């Protein structure tokens, strides 16, 4: 574990801190994350979760009670890429490519019973070849948190990842966060103000959730054409199904891959300034 020379700190992960590093032994350049015991097992589980759109976990080093995770390294994250494309916007075909690749990754994970649980632009990594990859699966930003989590569901599903990805999809298109709440309640109310306060008609069981309160103000659902213009109907339709309140109504990654929005998907390459 002293076979790694640090080159720079590329992130302050929720869990710990992430470093760009190089293996003195195998010379490869990597991302090193400086982090109980079921941890060692579950994380270890993640090593065999290998897919082109999932950052590979290379090595797990437990030592000196200082768990080190060694990941494949990518030079840029989507957050920085969005900020750099803010003035011109990311071209739709690249938005579409990225969404499609991300859905492929999730459908893979989800098929193996792994959730990400904390998808955010910072956790999506891109390379020069037009690839995008899911990073840093969880075992401050609440902007991408699905409403069932905010309402106190402890046994949430793979649908929470579809929620987050839809929020990111929206942000790529409009160049502004869909629901930038700065508290849990603010986050929930921003969602309600836009998609309308949910009730038993559109979400059976919602008024029985642990943090649901009858006193929640009741907002009407906003015009969906108002939310992500000027995205086309293929796009809006896929996004609406990604943002269904009811987790069991929310589209699955696998079905999303079949939506007509991806009829003409291609794989462009971003112009990256590393």
Ligand X SMILES: O=C1Nc2ccc(Br)cc2/C1=C1/Nc2ccccc2C1=O
Binds ligand X by CB under 6 A, chosen from 33, 96, 145, 259: 33
In whole angstroms, the minimum distance from the beta carbon of 245 to ligand X comes to: 30
Binds ligand X by CB under 6 A, chosen from 46, 90, 109, 125: 125
In whole angstroms, the minimum distance from the beta carbon of 239 to ligand X comes to: 26
If the CB atoms of residues 80 and 267 are measured against ligand X, the closer one turns out to be 80
118 scored as a contact of ligand X (CB under 6 A): no
Binds ligand X by CB under 6 A, chosen from 21, 46, 54, 74: 74
Binds ligand X by CB under 6 A, chosen from 19, 68, 73, 192: 73
- The answer to whether 9 and 18 have CB atoms below 8 angstroms apart is yes
**Distance from C-alpha of 178 to C-alpha of 143, rounded to nearest angstrom:** 8
Q: Considering only residues 50-69, where is the footprint of ligand X by CB under 6 A?
A: 55
Structure tokens given for 140: 């401050």
Question: Does residue 118 carry a catalytic annotation?
Answer: yes
Q: Considering only residues 132-161, where is the footprint of ligand X by CB under 6 A?
A: 135-136
**Distance from C-alpha of 189 to C-alpha of 183, rounded to nearest angstrom:** 10
Report DSSP letters for 19-73, one per residue: EEEEETTT--EEEEEE---HHHHHHHHHHT---TTBPPEEEEE--TT--EEEEE-
Q: Residue 191: which residues within 8 A CB-CB, separation 6 or more? A: 147, 150, 179, 181
Structure tokens given for 157: 């599903």
Q: Which residues in the chain have their C atom more than 2.5 Å from the N of the next written residue, marking a break after them? A: 35, 139
85 scored as a contact of ligand X (CB under 6 A): no
Catalytic residue among 59, 83, 118, 211: 118
Binds ligand X by CB under 6 A, chosen from 76, 101, 197, 252: 76
Judged by phi (left if over 0) then psi (alpha if -120 to 50, else beta), residue 64 lies in: left
**Which amino acids are annotated as binding site for Mg(2+), given as ranges?**
123, 136
Which parts of this chain interact with ligand X (CB under 6 A)?
Answer: 10-11, 13, 18, 31, 33, 55, 71, 73-77, 125, 135-136
Annotated catalytic residues are 118
């Amino acid at each position: 574990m002293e076979n790694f020379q640090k080159v720079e700190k590329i992130g302050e992960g929720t869990y710990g801190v992430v470093y760009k590093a190089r293996n003195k032994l195998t010379g490869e350049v990597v991302a090193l994350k400086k982090i109980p015991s079921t941890a060692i097992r579950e994380i270890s589980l993640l090593k065999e979760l290998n897919h082109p759109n999932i950052v590979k976990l290379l090595d797990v080093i437990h030592t000196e009670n200082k768990l080190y995770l060694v990941f494949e390294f990518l030079h840029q994250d989507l957050k920085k890429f969005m900020d750099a494309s803010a003035l011109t916007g990311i071209p739709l075909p690249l938005i579409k490519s990225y969404l499609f690749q991300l859905l492929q990754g999730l459908a893979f994970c989800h098929s193996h019973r792994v959730l990400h649980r904390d998808l955010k632009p910072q956790n999506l990594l891109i390379n020069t070849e037009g690839a995008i990859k899911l990073a840093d699966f969880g075992l401050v930003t609440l902007w991408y948190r699905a409403p069932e989590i905010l309402l106190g569901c402890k046994y949430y599903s793979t649908a929470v990842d579809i929620w987050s990805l839809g929020c990111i999809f929206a942000e790529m298109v409009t160049r502004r966060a869909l629901f930038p709440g700065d508290s849990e309640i603010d986050q929930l109310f921003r969602i309600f103000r836009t998609l309308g306060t949910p009730d038993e008609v559109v979400w059976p069981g919602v008024t029985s959730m642990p943090d649901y309160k009858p006193s929640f103000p009741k907002w009407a659902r906003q015009d969906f054409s108002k939310v992500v213009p000027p995205l086309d109907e293929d796009g809006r339709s896929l996004l609406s199904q990604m943002l269904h309140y009811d987790p069991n109504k929310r589209i699955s990654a696998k079905a999303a891959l079949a939506h007509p929005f991806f009829q003409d998907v291609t794989k462009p390459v971003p112009h990256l300034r590393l």
